Amino acid sequence: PKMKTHRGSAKRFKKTGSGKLKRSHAYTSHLFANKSQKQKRKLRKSAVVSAGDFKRIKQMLANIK
Amino acid sequence: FEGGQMPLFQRLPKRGFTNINRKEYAVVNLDKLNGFAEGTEVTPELLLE
Amino acid sequence: ARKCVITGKKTTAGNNRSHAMNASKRTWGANLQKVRILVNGKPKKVYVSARALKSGKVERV
RNA sequence: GAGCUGUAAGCAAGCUUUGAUCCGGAGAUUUCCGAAUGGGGAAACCCACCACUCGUAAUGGAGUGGUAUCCAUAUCUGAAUUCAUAGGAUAUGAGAAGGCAGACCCGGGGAACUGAAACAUCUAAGUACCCGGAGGAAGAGAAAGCAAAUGCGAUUCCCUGAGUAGCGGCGAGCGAAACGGGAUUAGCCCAAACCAAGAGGCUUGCCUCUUGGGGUUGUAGGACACUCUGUACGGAGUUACAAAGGAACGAGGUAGAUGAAGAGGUCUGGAAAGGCCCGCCAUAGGAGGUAACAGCCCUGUAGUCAAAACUUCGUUCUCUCCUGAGUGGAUCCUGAGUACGGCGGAACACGUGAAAUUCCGUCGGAAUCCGGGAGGACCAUCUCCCAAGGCUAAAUACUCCCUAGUGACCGAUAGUGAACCAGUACCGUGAGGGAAAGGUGAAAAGCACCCCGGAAGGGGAGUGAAAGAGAUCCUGAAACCGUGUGCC
RNA sequence: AAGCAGAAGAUGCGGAGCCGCAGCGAAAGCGAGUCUGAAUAGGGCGCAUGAGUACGUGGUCGUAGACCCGAAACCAGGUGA
RNA sequence: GUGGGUAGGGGUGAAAUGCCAAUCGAACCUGGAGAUAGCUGGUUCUCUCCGAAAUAGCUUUAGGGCUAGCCUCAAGGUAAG
RNA sequence: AACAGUGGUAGGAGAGCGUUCUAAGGGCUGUGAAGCCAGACCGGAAGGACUGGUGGAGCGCUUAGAAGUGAGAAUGCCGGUAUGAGUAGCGAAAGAGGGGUGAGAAUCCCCUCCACCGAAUGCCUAAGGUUUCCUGAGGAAGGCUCGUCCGCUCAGGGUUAGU
RNA sequence: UAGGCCCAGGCGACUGUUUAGCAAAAACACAGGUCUCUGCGAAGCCGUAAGGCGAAGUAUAGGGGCUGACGCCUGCCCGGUG
RNA sequence: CCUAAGGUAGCGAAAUUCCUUGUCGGGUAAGUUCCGACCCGCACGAAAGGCGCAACGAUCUGGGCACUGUCUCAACGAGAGACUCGGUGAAAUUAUAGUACCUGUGAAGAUGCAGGUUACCCGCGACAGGACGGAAAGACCCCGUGGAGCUUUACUGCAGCC
RNA sequence: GGGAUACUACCCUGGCUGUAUUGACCUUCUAACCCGCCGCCCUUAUCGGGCGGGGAGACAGUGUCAGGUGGGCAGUUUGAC
RNA sequence: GGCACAAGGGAGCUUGACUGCGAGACCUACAAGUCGAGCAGGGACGAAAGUCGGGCUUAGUGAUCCGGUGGUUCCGCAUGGA
Ligand SMILES: [K+]
Ligand SMILES: [K+]
Ligand SMILES: [K+]
Ligand SMILES: [K+]
Ligand SMILES: [K+]
Ligand SMILES: [K+]
Ligand SMILES: [K+]
Ligand SMILES: [Mg+2]
Ligand SMILES: [Mg+2]
Ligand SMILES: [Mg+2]
Ligand SMILES: [Mg+2]
Ligand SMILES: [Mg+2]
Ligand SMILES: [Mg+2]
Ligand SMILES: [Mg+2]
Ligand SMILES: [Mg+2]
Ligand SMILES: [Mg+2]
Ligand SMILES: [Mg+2]
Ligand SMILES: [Mg+2]
Ligand SMILES: [Mg+2]
Ligand SMILES: [Mg+2]
Ligand SMILES: [Mg+2]
Ligand SMILES: [Mg+2]
Ligand SMILES: [Mg+2]
Ligand SMILES: [Mg+2]
Ligand SMILES: [Mg+2]
Ligand SMILES: [Mg+2]
Ligand SMILES: [Mg+2]
Ligand SMILES: [Mg+2]
Ligand SMILES: [Mg+2]
Ligand SMILES: [Mg+2]
Ligand SMILES: [Mg+2]
Ligand SMILES: [Mg+2]
Ligand SMILES: [Mg+2]
Ligand SMILES: [Mg+2]
Ligand SMILES: [Mg+2]
Ligand SMILES: [Mg+2]
Secondary structure, three states: OOOOOOHHHHOOOEEOOOOOEEEOOOOOOOOHHHOOHHHHHHHOOOEEOOHHHHHHHHHHHOOOO | OOEOEOOHHHHOOOOOOOOOOOOOOOOOOHHHHOOOOOOOOOOHHHHHO | OOOOOOOOOOOEEEEEEOOOOOEEEEEEOOOEEEEEEEOOOOEEEEEEEHHHHHHOOOOOO
């Protein structure tokens, strides 16, 4: 059978041009009183998946273009 | 699986939505048109053939 | 059996659902009622569903 | 077309060219049990009744046929009760029953282990299993469809869409469809309006029921009016579109027939099919067997033929059946406890969610052509269809069985559990579980006779190529058990 | 690819579909840029600094029993007084 | 003694969780089923090149797992060690 | 050629040996194939030859391909055979002698005496077994020894109802 | 072949029953006591239902809980739970 | 002061008493047991009945008498095994074994290693110190995001009932 | 006096009656449903069915929906260092 | 650990306890955490230079999913809305 995409991951990551994965930051849901504006500005931006994690989960997104 | 440490994907928030009416265009750059001969009317039908 | 002779309504299976959504099997009975009707043009008393009686085409004897 | 009376030796008695054994088609017979059905019963046993027949003085006895239940048809009777009805009796029925092919199909019921690294929603899974209905296929099917185009045009199945859209303690996981490319193609019939006939309720000029005609659809169709037209000239058809029947012919199936070419010479050898030297046939150099490896030895093969009888398909003929065009928009018809809705569940990939669509129980409950449904809550506009009736082949699924074949499938601890008298022996009260076990030789030519022995078993002698091939009989490894002794 | 021809073959046909040449953005959308932002600013991801695709072998992974043997148990249908 | 009846989410019990075919805190047989097993055991020819770890973080986690560290192969940069 | 290096578990990488099958070439074999049994041969290893004995009809070699491809361990499965070992045991009990039979006798037959049961170890008859019953023959196996004997083997035969 | 006996205490009144195959007992049962349910289609129990047991019985009967011959007795508490 | 109310009768070192062999009396030369009392009842008590109780018991407990190989303390005899001969002939176990002792060493308890000591080869009848002997993948303990049976005012459900 | 009285037109507060609806409740009734009551027939029949009395009766029973109770039963949970 | 050109005390005016960001670093398995010149917008104080993106520095906190609220040149399943 075809390998099945991990649907939870498909909702969280996006492939970049060179095949990196784009992600959102954690700690961006609530409790913003407890975070400085500097943190909030930075957590608002996207990030890339780390090398360590990328190899663990690369196969979960194989079907995604 | 990470032994019970919360998996990466679950630590991160879902983003965005999918637009049903999303249009994708077959793009052609000017260098590609350069392959044709002068005076030709380059239509999508000509490109596809 | 508890099956309507006219419409065929009988017990049917399904799930009971708790608030926590636990599924357990159960049946839905037809609302069958003892009534005198014609069976082969001979008035017998048989079980008929109230719904089949609702119309009034099923005449009692 | 010359032997035959099975494995299976043996003795016996016989049969066969006046055509046996053997092979194929169609018949006859077919004990008893078994759905088992005359009644009963611990299956393969017992006991009856009714006709007819054998036998007895008669009883006792025997043979043949009938005698289950339910359902259908016809007839006769008809309770409480008056008519009736229930019920009962008789006759008539190639009506049903049960089995299986451990498969495939459609339904009724429907798990748990397991996954989620625990677990309850969820998964496993509508799976396993039980039950019902069946058919050679089943289901689906001729748009209240898909879509959003200068659109498509029943259903089913394959490719693709796509592991996408989505669903999801948004966890584990689950997971489409339409478009597009293909296989296969095929469409039809009713209900209602209306007409005619007939009948009973007279409900009393109305109504219901029953026959035939009529009629079948959506920017509407039909009835009803108008014309035109056929009434078989011509069309169709037993696979839907009505339903059975009969011929002639063709090609097959179920036995068979014919079928080319070397004992070539010579060399080993028990025995040539092998070696060496020569030929020949081939629409035949597939295969098996034959004393070692055969195109030319046998059965065969290629090729060409063959059927009294039964059976399958096909094509014609017979036979059977059959009108379909245009213009009207007065009126009428176009599937009611239905569509749909609330409540409770289920199926849709879609877990109630913003939840369209489909199904069930319960309750409520439309419009009906100035009408109705859908396009994923819902409204409006637009687009596409016309539900609440039915039928419909092909493409698809599966194989227990039959025929012909194939394998970089097994070769006796393998391959089926079972190469062999295997679902056996054995084990179990029972459901059930379930083995081990192949090889003489080319040919029995299966060791006459002699010696030791009660016999078994040997030693000679014979057969054979070989008996160190003698019946657990090709080969005969290791463990293991011995005998003799070169060194210690 | 299915499928149609063909020795259960090779092959021929079949271009639907699939991947790549363009990326950025949640999306509308824009495009060698694009998103963020008031901004010709900075920065992110890209481009300039380019090779993919079909098939075969090998390594690993996913789904399948998934390297082999092993529970106590659970559930379903039956068999036994 | 004979003939019968009660059957496993059950029966029977002057009650011991006793007994229900040498089996009973839930009989036996077959099936789901090759249940599952982060646990134990086993995993078959040879030589050569290189060669660990027994640590950190997180973990309903502690004899399991995942990322990093440490090993190996390949390709680049290269001379940066 | 020079220089340097060459312990190794988990593990990574490379190069090979061997087994079964297929294709294509080229061979071997009744003047003896495979297998088996020896040997003091060959290669760095897995391994490969040569010779002789047995065997009696199939089998290598080269290149490539495909795998049910390599066993010493799983209280592994199956078969065979060991060790314990001439050891434990030979399953309640009174036998002795004289004849007979016989290839063979503690064990079978007959005789004599003795001994045991005798509210049974007697007689009958169930359930159950299903020919074990009688006669003749036999001594492979079974019988915890023996065997001429047997409930065993082989041949026959045997079950009679109106009560 | 055929009882050893006596004295005293604990437990159970007694005969009886029980872990087939490590427990025979003080455990179970028991007659007796009490509480409670049940007006008969009884309650209770088996079954989805039909059909049954109860019972071919009828409150002096039937089911359930507890106690356990017999003798003398069985005190206080209804706040909590039923 | 608190509570709903604060244990009465009877019994009591008990099938109940930890301290405990309580203290006192009896029984013995000597009595952690026994019997009779006492009552500071760890933690009796009135139908999960309290206290008595004739008869009963393969019940539990203590003491006497009879009686004895139970014992002081063993002896003899009989039969069946053992043992020898003839016949027949297993089993658990087993890595291969030419299988000594002492001290030491070692995964810390050695027939097998080290240093010494001792020992001619092969059996038979006997005993069990060792081979951490055989048997049974420890039942104790701990662990596994194992199982099953049971309980409840654990969670979530279902039948039944209203 | 805040406001003027007669009478008439249109209205409100409060109460009452009637007409028509709307429930809720009360009794009573009989034909649904029920009878493990009697008599007769099918019919040699303690089943079943039909007929006729009697009792009960719009309740009960049953179906759908809802609340409460519910270890009677079931699936599970009940930490690491 | 710093601090007396104060980071300790007092006074005037104010809200930078700002918006978009951010070269480059620290720390680090990941997820996170920390520092940051400088640029732009619009401001506070100051004559100006200039300082100000909280507090002398280092604790005062919780992922995702799922809900609530406000804004919005986003999407809206034929079309316009919803
Ligand atoms: K063999
Ligand atoms: K039974
Ligand atoms: K030879
Ligand atoms: K001996
Ligand atoms: K030594
Ligand atoms: K040892
Ligand atoms: K429970
Ligand atoms: Mg799980
Ligand atoms: Mg011929
Ligand atoms: Mg010929
Ligand atoms: Mg030969
Ligand atoms: Mg076999
Ligand atoms: Mg041969
Ligand atoms: Mg038993
Ligand atoms: Mg399963
Ligand atoms: Mg956790
Ligand atoms: Mg193998
Ligand atoms: Mg011995
Ligand atoms: Mg004996
Ligand atoms: Mg005899
Ligand atoms: Mg013998
Ligand atoms: Mg007693
Ligand atoms: Mg007694
Ligand atoms: Mg016992
Ligand atoms: Mg005992
Ligand atoms: Mg008691
Ligand atoms: Mg009291
Ligand atoms: Mg007490
Ligand atoms: Mg009490
Ligand atoms: Mg008592
Ligand atoms: Mg001995
Ligand atoms: Mg030491
Ligand atoms: Mg030592
Ligand atoms: Mg263990
Ligand atoms: Mg579970
Ligand atoms: Mg612990």
